[PDB]
Amino acid sequence: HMPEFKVDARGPIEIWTIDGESRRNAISRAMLKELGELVTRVSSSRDVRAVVITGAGDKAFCAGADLKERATMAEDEVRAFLDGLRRTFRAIEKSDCVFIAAINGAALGGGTELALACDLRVAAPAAELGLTEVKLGIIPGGGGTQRLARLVGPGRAKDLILTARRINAAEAFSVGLANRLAPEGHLLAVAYGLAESVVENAPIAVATAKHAIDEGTGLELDDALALELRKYEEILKTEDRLEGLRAFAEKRAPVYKGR
Template identity: 30%
Template sequence: MLFANQRLPLISVSLVQGKAIGGGAEICTACDFRLMTEESEIRFVHKHMGIVPGWGGASRLIQIIGPRQALKLLSSAQGIHPEHALSIGLADDILSSTADKAMEEAQTWISSYTKGPAETIRAIKKVVTSGREHALVDSLRKEKDIFGTVWGGPVHLQALSKVLKRN
């Protein structure tokens, strides 16, 4: 499983091959996107251990799939297979590759979201993180501030130049 936190400045993805159980399920929720191979499973087994998620997995799960679905997954401790995970929004895609090719397929999948100037991708990630973590009025203010960091910058000016040349 690849892991990167949602608070990182760039886009992160988890690739579930096999079983992501307990803490592994929590780690999945910390990424921006979740990809699963056909034979994989995510399972929040905390109930069977007499505990609840403690690494932020429950709170993030609620944000990702909503409180009703999160209650079902946490209180049932059932395994979530790729098709179900996709249908409730826990997974973003199911990869059809064999285990040895899944990483390559995942890199191809994520590349459409990460292609482009790192400065712009970081700014997009900041705007989304702010919108997720702050009240609307604070998020709007933060978005304006982030916009100011890229407006008129080298990447923006280069993009404008290309558009003007085409017209």
């Protein structure tokens, strides 16, 4: 039997491919379990500093919850699955590792909410994203309403969520939902280059800045500045910040150890 993810590990960067092309890379409980374990692994040390998540094929990044498996699941199993999915999105945000969603096709439902929980997004020409829950009488249940509004603002969020329309790669780039647009056939080359541009920077500094950004939202200005300054004073105590000064003084690339 084949694992839910193909892992292409390249030292400080890994590429995780959802190996589910025939089921539109949907989130089964087994897929979710592997995803959670991968996140826990890269979150437990500073060996891995950026992860690219993508789906197999050219049709689906991730269709969301697996509706075949849903036919085997009672109400309480559905609720426990959605709880685990929310916890996994939050683990991605709280992780010191940076997460890049390489959107190779359609994202819907939980698959869109996965892309929104990532730090950065790259869109192939076939990328599409949708939160279509209101068509079926519910709302996004894995943070999609809040995470979309925080990223594109309330007007664009209402547009997508209340009309339940899909957004294509060009519009996703124009509104900042996609940070990069990749040419035909170069999705993972672009996503990997993005990861390279992150992991040459210091891992605790990247992590701390990531968390400062996310944790400052919803605070008034002075509270948010106080939060940033606590994190600045924390990072000054690291050994890596000294290596940064030494590398700058010695006109060489820094070699950071994650301490």
